[PDB]
Amino acid sequence: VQARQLLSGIVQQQNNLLRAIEAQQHLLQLTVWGIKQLQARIL
């Protein structure tokens, strides 16, 4: 219980990283379709 404020910051930090990774997932998935659309345009 001494490390209470630290643990709280750690847990909030893990949600910060999770939200960042999820937002990157959405962007990565846009780039996946962007590449697929270009591949169709060539082929």
Binding site: L7, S8, V11, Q14, N15, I21, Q25
Partner: protein
């Protein structure tokens, strides 16, 4: 391969979301 990776990622993030809730509930039981 791409679709297998998309599936894997979303499963891992689902698991991380469930763990985030459990951690926040365990943190609350110490009074945050």
């Amino acid at each position: 391969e791409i679709e297998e990776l998309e599936k894997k990622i979303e499963e891992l993030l689902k698991k991380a979301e469930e763990q985030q809730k459990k951690n926040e509930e365990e943190l609350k039981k110490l009074e945050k």
